[PDB]
Amino acid sequence: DILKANKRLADKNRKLLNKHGVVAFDFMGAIGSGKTLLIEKLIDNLKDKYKIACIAGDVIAKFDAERMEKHGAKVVPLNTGKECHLDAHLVGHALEDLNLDEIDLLFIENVGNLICPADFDLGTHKRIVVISTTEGDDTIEKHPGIMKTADLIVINKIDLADAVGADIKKMENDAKRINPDAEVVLLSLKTMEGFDKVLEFIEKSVKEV
Amino acid sequence: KDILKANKRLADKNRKLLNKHGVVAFDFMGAIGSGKTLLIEKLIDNLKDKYKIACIAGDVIAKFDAERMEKHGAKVVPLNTGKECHLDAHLVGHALEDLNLDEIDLLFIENVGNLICPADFDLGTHKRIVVISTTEGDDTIEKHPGIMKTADLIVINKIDLADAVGADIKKMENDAKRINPDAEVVLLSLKTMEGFDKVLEFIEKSVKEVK
Numbered sequence A: 001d002i003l004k005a006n007k008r009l010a011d012k013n014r015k016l017l018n019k020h021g022v023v024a025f026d027f028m029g030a031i032g033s034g035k036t037l038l039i040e041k042l043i044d045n046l047k048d049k050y051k052i053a054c055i056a057g058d059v060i061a062k063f064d065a066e067r068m069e070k071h072g073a074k075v076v077p078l079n080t081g082k083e084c085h086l087d088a089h090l091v092g093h094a095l096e097d098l099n100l101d102e103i104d105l106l107f108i109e110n111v112g113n114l115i116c117p118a119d120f121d122l123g124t125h126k127r128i129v130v131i132s133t134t135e136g137d138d139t140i141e142k143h144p145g146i147m148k149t150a151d152l153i154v155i156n157k158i159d160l161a162d163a164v165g166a167d168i169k170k171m172e173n174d175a176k177r178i179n180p181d182a183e184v185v186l187l188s189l190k191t192m193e194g195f196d197k198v199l200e201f202i203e204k205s206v207k208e209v
Numbered sequence B: 001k002d003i004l005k006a007n008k009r010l011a012d013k014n015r016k017l018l019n020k021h022g023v024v025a026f027d028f029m030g031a032i033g034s035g036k037t038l039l040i041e042k043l044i045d046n047l048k049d050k051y052k053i054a055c056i057a058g059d060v061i062a063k064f065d066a067e068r069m070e071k072h073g074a075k076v077v078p079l080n081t082g083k084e085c086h087l088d089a090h091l092v093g094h095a096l097e098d099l100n101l102d103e104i105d106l107l108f109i110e111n112v113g114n115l116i117c118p119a120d121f122d123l124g125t126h127k128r129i130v131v132i133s134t135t136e137g138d139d140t141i142e143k144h145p146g147i148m149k150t151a152d153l154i155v156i157n158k159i160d161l162a163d164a165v166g167a168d169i170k171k172m173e174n175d176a177k178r179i180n181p182d183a184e185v186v187l188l189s190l191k192t193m194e195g196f197d198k199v200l201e202f203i204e205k206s207v208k209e210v211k
């Protein structure tokens, strides 16, 4: 079984991160939802207080790895080929290329996709799902599985909602109905509205481990 | 894994069945929310006077898009795709059993929203259309060259929103042409309808060129 084998490696990964005092976050989303830009902003705001590392996973991982690196983060690129999602196996090897005693926060950018990364625990402490208004306001209700795995649901690009005809209150209500336990934040990474709430989720999650 | 060899056999059988009944089929792929359904809706509205049109709508919860296509006057077979990140020829083959192919001229299949998995899975269609949009970012085409190479038409949709996301549409258009020199590349807005003429052109040309 592939799912049993993943959970095994996820717990192993999580055990290793805890040993070295690292708090890890899994950033999932659709394609272009805003994962990298969110991580970029988080690095800029948190790097004074925390030592931050990133794992950037995509077909061509260099695009986002380089985007993260310039913000002052240690970054491990992971070329994911035709895989729909990152897994605890690939993440485990990425952790071997990190000095976890010189790192406090780990931001993992998962492959852009709303089906597959649901079911694949990477060994992180929290999971963030970033969707955007430009995907249409049915995007949350159309993908309940992944939404239920989220600790934070980010509804990004609120500044473009009217232009696509997206109802952001519908999206907010959909997220809360499908996952009552998750935090839900309305965000624009352009205007920065709602960014303080995402930052707060990160900071609290770290202190709660 | 022998998955792709078995799929190809079924895809060829699907194409033969479609050709037998004079149906031209189109596989609509893309990212999440790129505009596949809205494009299909617009195509139905503008071609239904000339062609009898059927759709296959595949997604986790297929009803959302099936219901949209239904109100535009197409016969729709919904496919609830579960955790699968692509449709395949097998499921499409069985969907074809629910259609009267002697009363259909065009088949529009909306694949699941994913730029990775559908690349390797031929559905048994005549043409493949990849819809991406400016709001996903202007690196989207060069970040996923695999699926782009499988496209006969590449649609760069939501051009009306490019400035608001900082996307360079000229860059994206060049990315698409360079990665797939054989594909048609269309800049589109389904809001203003600019570029729609070129999509219709592709559909009609494809129909005329079959076999």
Ligand SMILES: Nc1nc2c(ncn2[C@@H]2O[C@H](COP(=O)(O)OP(=O)(O)OP(O)(O)=S)[C@@H](O)[C@H]2O)c(=O)[nH]1
Pocket: A029, A030, A031, A032, A033, A034, A035, A036, A037, A038, A058, A064, A111, A112, A156, A157, A158, A159, A160, A187, A188, A189, A190, A191, B135, B136, B137, B138, B140, B143, B164, B165, B166, B167
């Ligand atoms: N207008 C506006 N644009 C945004 C917002 N958030 C992200 N974007 C834009 O969306 C595009 C995609 O953002 P990006 O950060 O690259 O997404 P991503 O999820 O990481 O994309 P991926 O390829 O790895 S799957 C970029 O052009 C970025 O500027 C927002 O809140 N408002």
Ligand SMILES: Nc1nc2c(ncn2[C@@H]2O[C@H](COP(=O)(O)OP(=O)(O)OP(O)(O)=S)[C@@H](O)[C@H]2O)c(=O)[nH]1
Pocket: A134, A135, A136, A137, A139, A142, A163, A164, A165, A166, B030, B031, B032, B033, B034, B035, B036, B037, B038, B039, B059, B065, B112, B113, B157, B158, B159, B160, B161, B188, B189, B190, B191, B192
């Ligand atoms: N402004 C603008 N909005 C568009 C354009 N094309 C589509 N949209 C909007 O984008 C959103 C997504 O469109 P939709 O047709 O549902 O995408 P889809 O690709 O079929 O989405 P999916 O859930 O099946 S994966 C909708 O809100 C729609 O109104 C466009 O060209 N310009």
Ligand SMILES: [Mg+2]
Pocket: A035, A036, A037, A064, A109
């Ligand atoms: Mg990214």
Ligand SMILES: [Mg+2]
Pocket: B036, B037, B038, B065, B110
């Ligand atoms: Mg759709």
Ligand SMILES: [Zn+2]
Pocket: A089, A093
């Ligand atoms: Zn290994």
Ligand SMILES: [Zn+2]
Pocket: B090, B094
């Ligand atoms: Zn069968």
